[PDB]
């Protein structure tokens, strides 16, 4: 009864040109990147007042929606309740920073309390660069694209000159040893391997089983219901394996590349590392099995199983050519359950191939990037006739 004293915000209800979204919604992230758990950084951000602000904003929405699902009265409690947790999430990272007179440092958080709260609701309207995935692709591609520009702008030398760049250093070396030591700034060699990963993934992205579908009333044009080989967005599958990896690491750190328990760890080496295969081969086995396990369970909960798809098609009045409505499920069951199990296995195997080859971005994460950039590609092509 005490929650009916907070108003909400308004939204536009008119057609908006795509140019405005592609030009304006893609900017204003520099303020968050002014400063640009190092292994754990790949989750949302790197700095520990800036913090991350990616997970908390969507977490507030998830909490409000689950509270609603646990009506104008409840509608007014949606936009108003996010401000309740908006202060909690901002102070949450700061107090964590304190544990692992310092009270004066809390003044720095004054600005950061509301920096990302305003942007949370506005970016969703328009092109569709929401769900925080637009933030992830921008920073993930950044570490790949600005990697080339780092070499000319790098001032640190270490042992060899770098202020003038390292891609072309014929005067410095020459005779010339083009096969230098790629232990720092591997910009010369990692680009060779990563482009192979880009080509292979897009090839497997286009795999799908096309199911003949027709309107239940009109004779004529036949459409196909596409069941993608992955059949699951990369974020639901890869995050469920990324989160558990992060959860494992933080647990061991509280309770691993050096001076840490090495019972479970991803392999990392130039070329190949092999002392006891009982560790390396087990890692991929648990990685592949978990991905298929995560992908197979996601469709059971996300309303994308064979049973749910048929209900969607029945609602849209779409039928198979020569099957009854009840036979929709059986034909879908021929491909849907096995595509999730095998698609999750394949995307996990692509990560292992990406990690082993040592591509840009340390292998993992680029699978998320290539899929989402493809995800908006289907919008881009269809909006251009």
């Amino acid at each position: 009864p005490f929650c009916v004293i907070l108003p909400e915000i308004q939204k536009p209800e008119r057609k908006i040109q795509f140019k405005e979204k592609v030009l304006w919604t893609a900017i204003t992230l520099f303020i968050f990147l002014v400063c640009c758990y190092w292994m754990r950084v790949i989750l949302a951000s790197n700095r520990g007042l800036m913090a991350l602000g990616i997970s908390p904003i969507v977490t507030s929405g998830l909490i409000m929606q689950l509270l609603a699902g646990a009506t104008p009265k409840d509608r007014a409690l949606f936009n108003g309740a996010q401000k309740l947790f908006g202060m909690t999430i901002t102070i949450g990272q700061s107090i964590v920073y304190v544990m692992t007179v310092c009270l004066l440092i809390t003044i720095q958080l004054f600005v950061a309390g509301l920096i990302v709260l305003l942007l949370d609701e506005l970016l969703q309207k328009g092109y569709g660069l929401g769900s925080g995935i637009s933030l992830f692709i921008a920073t993930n591609i950044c570490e790949t694209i600005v990697w080339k520009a780092f070499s000319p702008t790098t001032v640190n030398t270490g042992r060899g000159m770098e202020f003038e760049g390292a891609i072309i250093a014929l005067f410095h070396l020459l005779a010339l040893r083009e096969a230098f030591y790629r232990q720092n700034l591997p910009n010369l060699m990692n680009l060779i391997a990563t482009i192979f990963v880009f080509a292979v993934v897009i090839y497997f992205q286009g795999f799908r089983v096309d199911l003949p579908i027709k309107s239940a009333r009109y004779r004529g044009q036949y459409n196909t219901y596409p069941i993608k080989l992955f059949y699951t967005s990369n974020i639901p599958i890869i995050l469920q394996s990324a989160l558990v990896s992060n959860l494992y690491v933080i647990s061991q750190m509280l309770s691993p590349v050096g001076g840490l328990c090495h019972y479970l760890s991803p392999p990392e080496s130039f070329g190949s590392v092999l002392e006891d295969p009982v560790h390396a081969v087990v890692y991929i086995v648990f990685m592949l099995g978990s991905c298929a396990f995560f992908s197979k369970t996601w469709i059971e909960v996300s309303g994308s199983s064979a049973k749910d798809v048929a209900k969607q098609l029945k609602e849209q009045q779409m039928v198979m050519r020569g099957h009854r409505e009840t036979s929709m499920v059986h034909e879908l069951n021929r491909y849907i359950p096995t595509a999730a199990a095998f698609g999750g296995l394949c995307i996990g195997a692509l990560s292992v191939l990406a990690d082993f080859l040592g591509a840009i971005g340390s292998g993992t994460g680029i699978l998320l990037a290539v899929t989402i950039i493809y995800q908006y590609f289907e919008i881009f092509v269809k909006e251009q006739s």
Partner: protein, 69 residues
């Protein structure tokens, strides 16, 4: 903890292999005599030396890696 009377000498050996590549850069190699009496304090009575190496290949089998590249 070597003990030597005056006007005599004792020989000791050390061996260092630079893990990081190096060339044309000597390091400290300072000789400090740590002799202590019953008081329990050590007085520092301290030259430098040189080291250099030419780098061609490294690793478990550097030659095959460079040939493959």
């Amino acid at each position: 903890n070597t003990v030597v009377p005056p006007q005599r000498q004792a020989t000791f050996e050390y061996s260092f292999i630079p893990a990081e590549p190096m060339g044309g850069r000597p390091f400290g190699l300072v000789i400090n005599l740590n002799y202590k009496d019953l008081n329990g304090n050590v007085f520092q009575d301290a030259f430098n030396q040189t080291v250099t190496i030419i780098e061609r290949e490294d690793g478990l089998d550097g030659e095959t890696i460079f040939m493959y590249m």
